[PDB]
Design a protein around this ligand. Structure first.
Ligand SMILES: CCCCCCCCCCCCCC(=O)CSCCNC(=O)CCNC(=O)[C@H](O)C(C)(C)COP(=O)(O)OP(=O)(O)OC[C@H]1O[C@@H](n2cnc3c(N)ncnc32)[C@H](O)[C@@H]1OP(=O)(O)O
Ligand SMILES: Cc1cc(F)ccc1-c1ccc2[nH]nc(CN(C)C)c2c1
Ligand SMILES: [Cl-]
Ligand SMILES: [Mg+2]
Length: 385
């Protein structure tokens, strides 16, 4: 297609290909003093709104907008239903700015109809660490689609990020845009087989009857790593060294400070689950997965698919297969129906043996204002929510 908005932006054109000797901005020597001070103009009757995600009621508003209008699969069966507490965690990480949590209201009803957000993160791309904004939760109400609101939201957050002297961004989407640095398919491991069959997500056939499908996905309720336990505050330093070390191998990863490790990993029920194996007061292995339910549209029996999404997993005392087998069992113990992972890091290597199935699409990783070589998803070492 044309990408008439995206081609005005500092991102690669559809045919751009850079070798590994190239790792730099499209536009360098930017000047904070030159950034527009005026808000981008919205159509008549709509206004910017600065959301306070720590206020329950403003946070409820964002929650309702996403619950009704956020991402669906291509068949419009499932819609992501991030919980309000999950949105609080995702948006209030260390050094967050309230002014990068941007809503648009329709003045006559006072209702929120659009949203976009960013948080700051140090991102290492091909061994250069850059202060960036991670952009997420871009949403326009279903009644106002294809009216070119989204570029307004994007330009307005880019302006507010640039005020902080930040000139690069990282973002992910299932849709193809100019132009991915990497592309990772997702895979799903069934936990509650029967439920997934009954809502249409998984299938039977003359060979695979219901009883046989259930048996296929049965797991033993005993951990490979016996001492794996919920992460506690005392474990923050050990997680930071274990994970920090591990992530240096990849082409793309966040550089976490200790404060970021406590925020992104300390457990919160129905939001983030992290488990650790401690030997001698050292953290030797970790598992983590976050909770992202999908609302089920038009199923008479079920309204919610409870799904655990693999986050960061590191083993030094087991095989990666054994670690991920434990991650599936811990998701099962926590009532999840399915365990979802992308082919990033070492994940793809355990998919066949641990009975994952290939999904319907892929997640694309993108950088704004950064020119570099693209790479296979095994070299991606970051997971965005
Ligand atoms: C230095 C700092 C830099 C900061 C900024 C970094 C960049 C951040 C970029 C954002 C990253 C967010 C990451 C993220 O949140 C995670 S990906 C999830 C995005 N959210 C949804 O999918 C929710 C359901 N859909 C919608 O709400 C609407 O369809 C949205 C709002 C998606 C588009 O609204 P619409 O009513 O359907 O469409 P128009 O207003 O008419 O706009 C059409 C223009 O929007 C382009 N478009 C469509 N989807 C996009 C997507 N997912 N990223 C970027 N661009 C997207 C499209 O290519 C077109 O441009 P083109 O004509 O050139 O092709
Ligand atoms: C289905 C799935 C499975 C999986 F294991 C990992 C990711 C996805 C998925 C696909 C499309 C998406 N669009 N936006 C999001 C939310 N963020 C990542 C921004 C998103 C996530
Ligand atoms: Cl403009
Ligand atoms: Mg629109």
């Amino acid at each position: 297609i044309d990408y008439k908005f995206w081609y005005t932006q500092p991102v690669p054109k559809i045919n751009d290909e850079f070798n590994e000797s190239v790792n730099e901005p499209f536009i360098s020597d930017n000047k904070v003093e030159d950034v527009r001070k005026d808000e981008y103009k919205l159509p008549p009757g709509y206004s910017w709104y600065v959301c306070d995600v720590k206020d329950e009621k403003d946070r409820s508003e964002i929650y309702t907008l996403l619950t009704d209008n956020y991402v669906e699969d291509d068949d419009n069966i499932f819609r992501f239903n991030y919980s309000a507490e999950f949105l609080l965690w995702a948006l209030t990480s260390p050094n967050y700015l309230k002014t990068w949590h941007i809503g648009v209201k329709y003045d006559a009803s006072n209702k929120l109809i659009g949203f976009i957000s960013a948080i700051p993160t140090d991102i290492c791309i091909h061994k250069r660490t850059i202060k960036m904004a991670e952009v997420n939760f871009l949403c326009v109400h279903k009644t106002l689609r294809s009216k070119r609101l989204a570029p307004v939201l994007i330009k307005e957050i880019t302006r507010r990020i640039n005020l902080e002297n930040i000139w690069q961004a990282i973002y992910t989407a299932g849709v193809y845009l100019p132009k991915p640095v990497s592309d990772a398919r997702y895979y799903h491991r069934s936990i509650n087989v029967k439920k997934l069959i009954e809502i249409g997500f998984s299938s039977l056939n003359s060979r695979l009857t219901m009883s046989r499908a259930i048996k296929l996905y049965r797991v033993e309720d005993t951990l490979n790593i016996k001492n794996m336990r919920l992460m506690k505050k005392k474990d923050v330093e050990g997680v930071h060294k274990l994970l920090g070390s591990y992530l240096e191998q990849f082409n793309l990863y966040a550089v976490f400070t200790k404060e970021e490790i406590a925020h992104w990993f300390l457990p919160i029920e129905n939001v983030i689950y992290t488990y650790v194996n401690e030997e001698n007061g050292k953290i030797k292995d970790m598992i983590s997965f976050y909770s992202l339910p999908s609302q089920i549209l038009g199923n008479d029996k079920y309204s919610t698919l409870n799904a655990a999404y693999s986050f960061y997993n590191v083993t030094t005392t087991a095989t990666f297969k054994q670690l991920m087998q434990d991650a599936i069992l811990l998701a099962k113990r926590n009532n999840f129906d399915v365990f979802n992972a992308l082919e990033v890091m070492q994940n793809k290597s355990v998919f066949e043996d641990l009975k994952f199935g290939e999904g319907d699409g892929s997640l694309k990783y993108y950088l704004y204002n950064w020119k570099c070589a693209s790479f296979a998803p095994a070299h991606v070492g970051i997971v965005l929510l």
